[PDB]
Symmetry: C3
Subunit: 337 residues, 3 copies
C-alpha cells in the first residue's frame, strides 16, 4: 500500500533487448515484490518493410517494431522512463493494458518532443498484455505505424498448466504482428513521403477500408526467415508470445501444435491444449507452449494463408535433432505410377 513502503522495495534495472528475443529474467520470482525499472526512447524513423523497398514512417518504442517485451512478476511495480527526443515531430504516450487507471497510463504520459515522463504501476494481473501509444485524436494512426509491443507478467510461482503442474520453458520468443496501411499511386505503386505528417490523410483513407497492404512479423516481410529464423532443438520447450494491437490473428506452427495455449493471454485462465490454430483478437497478446519433437524447418504463420504468404505474416523455425519415424515416415517417396 504506502508511498514509503514502496520506496523501501528493492529496485532492479533491466536492459531491454530487441525482439524477437527477451531480456534475462527468472520464471519463478526470487524473493518478494520489486520495482523493476525500464527506459525506452521513442523514435520516429523510416523503415523499409519489403524487398521492393516499400517505406513506412514508423513510430517505434526503443527503435523497433514491435517495441520490446518487458517481463515482471505479479505484484511487482513496473516503472517506466519514457523519453520523446526533440528530433521527433509528434506527441506520444503509452497505454499499458496490464495497468489499472488513467487509460492504462495514457492520460499521465503525454510527452511532446523534448519531454520525458516516469510512470509506475502495480502489475496486479498475470498474463501477457499489449502496450501501445494512444494520443487523443490520433490513436489508430500511432498504433498502425508500429507503436506497440507487449509485456509479460509472470505468476510469482512461474507458469503452470490448468491442473497445477509446473511448466518451465527453455526459451521464449516474442513475435509482434503488425498491420500496415501503405497508400498507393494510380499505377498501384506504393507512395513515399517526406515526413510522417505528410502521409496522414492518404493513410486514413486506406485504414477506413479495413484492409492492410502488409501484415508482418518483427516489422517487415521475411524479418524472421533465413539467417534470422528462430531456433530450437528436439526436446526443447519453447514459449512463443504473440501480440496484435489492432487486428485479429490466428497463429499456427506448420508441422507442430500449441501443446498449451493461453489464447486470451491470461495465466489465471486455464490453457487450451493440443491446439492446431489459435485465435488472438486485435488488442490482445497470447502465448503458446510447445515441445519440439521433430527436426527441420517449421513455418509459423497467421493462418489466413493470404495474409501469411501474400501479405507477409510468416516466420521460420530451424530445429536441430534426429527424425522420429514413429511420428511420421515416408513409406513411398514421390514416384511414377
Amino acid at each position: 500500500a504506502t508511498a514509503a513502503e514502496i520506496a523501501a522495495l528493492p529496485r532492479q534495472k533491466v536492459e531491454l533487448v530487441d525482439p524477437p528475443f527477451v531480456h534475462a529474467h527468472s520464471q519463478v520470482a526470487e524473493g518478494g515484490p520489486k520495482v523493476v525499472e525500464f527506459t525506452m526512447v521513442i523514435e520516429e524513423k523510416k523503415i523499409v518493410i519489403d524487398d521492393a523497398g516499400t517505406e513506412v514512417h514508423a513510430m517505434a518504442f526503443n527503435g523497433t517494431v514491435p517495441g520490446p517485451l518487458m517481463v515482471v512478476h505479479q505484484d511487482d511495480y513496473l516503472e517506466l522512463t519514457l523519453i520523446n527526443p526533440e528530433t521527433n515531430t509528434l506527441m506520444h504516450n503509452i497505454d499499458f493494458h496490464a495497468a489499472t487507471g488513467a487509460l492504462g497510463g495514457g492520460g499521465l504520459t503525454e510527452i511532446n518532443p523534448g519531454e520525458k515522463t516516469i510512470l509506475r504501476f502495480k502489475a496486479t494481473k498475470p498474463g501477457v498484455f499489449v502496450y501501445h501509444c494512444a494520443p487523443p485524436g490520433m490513436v489508430p494512426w500511432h498504433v498502425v505505424s508500429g507503436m506497440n509491443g507487449a509485456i509479460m507478467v509472470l505468476p510469482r510461482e512461474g507458469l503452470h498448466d490448468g491442473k497445477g503442474k509446473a511448466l518451465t520453458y527453455d526459451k521464449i520468443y516474442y513475435v509482434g504482428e503488425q498491420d500496415f496501411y501503405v497508400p498507393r499511386d494510380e499505377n498501384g505503386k506504393y507512395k513515399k513521403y517526406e515526413a510522417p505528417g505528410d502521409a496522414y490523410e492518404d493513410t486514413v483513407k486506406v485504414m477506413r477500408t479495413l484492409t492492410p497492404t502488409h501484415v508482418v512479423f518483427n516489422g517487415a516481410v521475411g524479418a524472421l526467415t533465413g539467417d534470422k529464423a528462430m531456433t530450437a532443438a528436439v526436446g526443447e520447450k519453447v514459449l512463443i508470445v504473440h501480440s496484435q494491437a489492432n487486428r485479429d490473428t490466428r497463429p499456427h506452427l506448420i508441422g507442430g501444435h500449441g501443446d498449451y495455449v493461453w489464447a486470451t493471454g491470461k495465466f489465471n485462465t486455464p490453457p487450451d491444449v493440443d491446439q492446431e490454430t489459435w485465435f488472438i483478437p486485435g488488442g490482445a497478446a497470447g502465448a503458446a507452449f510447445y515441445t519440439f519433437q521433430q527436426p527441420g524447418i517449421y513455418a509459423y504463420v497467421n493462418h489466413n494463408l493470404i495474409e501469411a504468404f501474400e501479405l507477409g505474416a510468416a516466420a521460420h523455425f530451424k530445429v536441430t535433432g534426429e527424425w522420429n519415424d514413429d511420428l511420421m515416415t515416408s513409406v513411398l517417396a514421390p514416384s511414377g505410377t
Copy 2:
C-alpha cells in the same frame, strides 16, 4: 410441463427501458418459474448516425437501436407481444437465439403492418443471447438496419464464478454494437432516401463488400459519450452486456479489465478471468463483470482501433471516487 401446468404459473408484466439501461429485475429469482410478459412495438424510422448528418432507415424494436434488453431466469417462459403498426411499410418477425424451434420463433411471428402476434417460449438455457428480425429473403438487410437486441436468461441462483462463488453486480449496462452500410454517390457523399425500400438495392451493393461505413454503439457515433457516458463509482461491481448480431467485435475497457468474462455469453461455461480484450463473434452476445478500482474517464471500445476511433465504436464510463497511488502513479509528470 403440460399446458395446464403453464396456465397456473404466475404472470409478471415487465415495462421495458431504453438501452443502455435495463429494466428492473432481481438477480436471484424470487420463487418458482413464471410467465414473464413483454410487449414491443416495431418502428421504421430515420436515424442520424454521425455528426455529418448521415441517415439510416432504421427498423427498430421499441424504437431504439439496439432493441431493449429483456431479462428472465432459467426455466421461466418469455411471452412476447409483438406489434407491427400500420404506419410501417415492411413485414417483420423475431428470432430469439435463446429459443428452441421454428427458426428461433421467426417462422411463427411473421407480421405485416397492421398485425400483432404473441409468442411464448421456455428459456431453457442460461446466458445472454441475441434476438433479431429475419424475414425470409431479406434477413441481413433487417439486421444491419438495426433490428436486433439481446435477452439475458439468468441462472435461478444468480451469477457465479468458475468455482461457485456468487457474483452480484451493482449496475448493469447493455451496449448493442451495430455495423451499418450506407451508400455513397459519385463524389463520396452518403445518399439519402425517402422510404426504406428505396435504399435496398444500393445498400445490398455495399453489404457485399463486407466493409461497414460505420460501426457504432447505441445507434450513433458518440451515443454513449460525454453526456450519455455510463457512470459508476470506485468499488462498484458492473456487468456489461455486449451484443453484435452480424459481425465480430473485440471489446476492451481502456484503463480496466474484464475480471470475469463470459465471452461466449453462456453462463454454464465458466468465465475467463483477468481479460484485457475479449472476443464476441457476430451472431452472439457476451458479458463482462468488473469492479472499478480507479476514478476518472474510461473508454470502452471495439479494439480494432480503426473501427473504434474512425468508424464510431467507442463509449465512455465516468467513474467517481478517490485515486489509488499504489495501483498507478505519475513519478515524474511530463517535463523538459
Copy 3:
C-alpha cells in the same frame, strides 16, 4: 513400442465417402491401435459454384470440395496413398494439421502429375483437424481453389463432456466451408479461363482484397439445401464437424444451439456448453453436438448473415418428429 510391434499392427483399408457424409467407423475403438489406410486421387476440374453458372477451376482431393473426412482414433497410424494423375497440370501435396513434422507431411508428399506417394503418421492428439494442400510458393492459391478437408481423431474411449460423462452421437455430418475469390471483368461479370494457370494472376489480385466473392458449404451455393438438406429426427444426437482452412467462420443452428461445442476442435480441451454461435478461426476445424428437440426446417449458417444469405454460406437440416408446445408455442398467430 518396438519396431517389430509397429510392423505387426493390423491394417484396415477404409473406403471414403463424399461430404457431408462420413465413412463408417466406431466411436469407441475396437481393440488396440491399427494402421488405417486411405487412398485419395487428386482431380483438377471445373465446377459450377452458384446459380449464375460461375465456374472455378477446383483442385479437389478425391474429386470433392471439401475433401472427405477421415476418421481414426488416438494413437492409430494413418497411412495415406495420394495419387496425382497424369491428366492434371500442377504439383500438389498434403499438410495434415493433425501430424507432427515435415510441415505436416507437406515436405514429403510433393507429387507431380503422374506420381504417387504414401505417407504414414501417428495420430497422437485427439480432435478434428484441417488438412490441405500447400506447395511452396503457391499455398493460398491451392487452398482457396478447394484443396482442403478435415480428419477426426477420436479418443479411444469415444467422446465425453467436461465432467467425463460419455457423449454418443447417432449421426455425424461434415460441413466444409470454402471462401472463393473469382475475378470479374470491367462489366462486373465473373471471368472464365481455359486452364487453372491462366486464372492465377487475376485470382491473386482478388485474394489480396481479403474479400471473397463466394463463401459456400460443400462446394456451391445451396449444396446442402432443398432435397440435399441434412436430416435428423427429434431425440437424435448429431455431431456437426465444420472446417475452414483459410478464413474465420461463426456457425449457428437457427432454431437450435450447440449443446456441447469444441470450438477449438480439440477433445482434451473441455467443450463450451449451450452455445448460440461459436467461432472457428481460419486454419481450424470445430465440432458441435446437439440433440434435436423440435421438428421442422433449421438453417445452419455462418452468422455473418451477409456471408450466409448473400454470399452462399447457408445449409438446411430437415428434422422429423412431434412439436413440443412447452418449449415454444404461438399464443396468438399473426392477425389484423
